[PDB]
């Protein structure tokens, strides 16, 4: 299903002023907006062509929300330092991700909203969009505050309404890129490393969205422990790249197969080195 997802990060810098806030928004794996409180001009800004036409009212509206959330995050960081009895001297990080998945009726299929402190799960909205899961006794304080503030009902209203409505608008305005899967273009390269071993590297290029599986098999047996698998990476043009490599006995290359799974492929792809 299609999704709209927002991501934000606040980072404190004690003794060097107030925390910095950076936020981005995505439809699927395509970014469309950014905000940085430390930017030369701190405003919501377009990062995809299909949002460039939105008027100054949209951009004013979004900018004000980002500035308000940055201010709230400053308070949250202060509260969290207290909960965990941490010194005023250390820098800390607060991350938030929330989003909506679009269902087959044009309404919410599922919503999610989660927060992390210093890179560890803190509190999450449950699938019912009514209750919260707290990671520890500090997040149970937040849980009690947000139950009393009826916070989940607010988040649910956004996820069920505004989130899905705008996700649908973006999907229509950017349909010729957002509603198009691009299959991976693959090839296998070969690099001898000794007088009896060689690297086989299986490539996937130019694919969208970013989710992909690349695996090597020997005689049909998965070799994941012995596979070097780089992180999926952006090409810079909206598509993604990945490779997986194994070191194999020279002369056994025919017994190794690379397997590729991607939504743009009608069936899983099986590859061999051919030269």
């Amino acid at each position: 299903s299609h999704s709209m997802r927002y991501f934000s990060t606040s980072v404190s810098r004690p003794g060097r002023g107030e925390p910095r806030f950076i936020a981005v928004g995505y439809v699927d794996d395509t970014q469309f907006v950014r905000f940085d409180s430390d930017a030369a001009s701190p405003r919501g800004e377009p990062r995809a062509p299909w949002v460039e036409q939105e008027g100054p009212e949209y951009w004013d509206r979004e900018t004000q929300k980002y500035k308000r959330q940055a201010q709230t995050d400053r308070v949250s960081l202060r509260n969290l330092r207290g909960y965990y009895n941490q010194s005023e001297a250390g820098s800390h990080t607060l991350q938030w991700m929330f989003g909506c998945d679009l269902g087959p009726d044009g309404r919410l299929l599922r919503g999610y909203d989660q927060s992390a402190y210093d890179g560890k799960d803190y509190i999450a909205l449950n699938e019912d969009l009514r209750s919260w899961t707290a990671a520890d006794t500090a997040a149970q304080i937040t849980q009690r505050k947000w139950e009393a503030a009826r916070e989940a009902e607010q988040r649910r209203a956004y996820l069920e309404g505004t989130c899905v409505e705008w996700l649908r608008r973006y999907l229509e305005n950017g349909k010729e890129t957002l509603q198009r899967a691009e299959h991976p273009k693959t090839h296998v390269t070969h690099h001898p490393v000794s007088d009896h071993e060689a690297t086989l590297r299986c490539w996937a290029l130019g694919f969208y969205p970013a989710e992909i599986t690349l695996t090597w098999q020997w005689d049909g047996e998965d070799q994941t422990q012995d596979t070097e698998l780089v992180e999926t990476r952006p090409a810079g043009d909206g598509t993604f790249q990945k490779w997986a490599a194994v070191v194999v006995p020279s002369g056994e290359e025919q017994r190794y197969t690379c397997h590729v799974q991607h939504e743009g492929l009608p069936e899983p792809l099986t590859l061999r080195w051919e030269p």
């Binding site: 709230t72 949250s76 927060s115 803190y122 509190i123 937040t142 505050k145 503030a149 916070e151």
Partner: peptide, 4 residues
């Protein structure tokens, strides 16, 4: 919204 609410602070943590």
């Amino acid at each position: 919204g609410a602070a943590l």
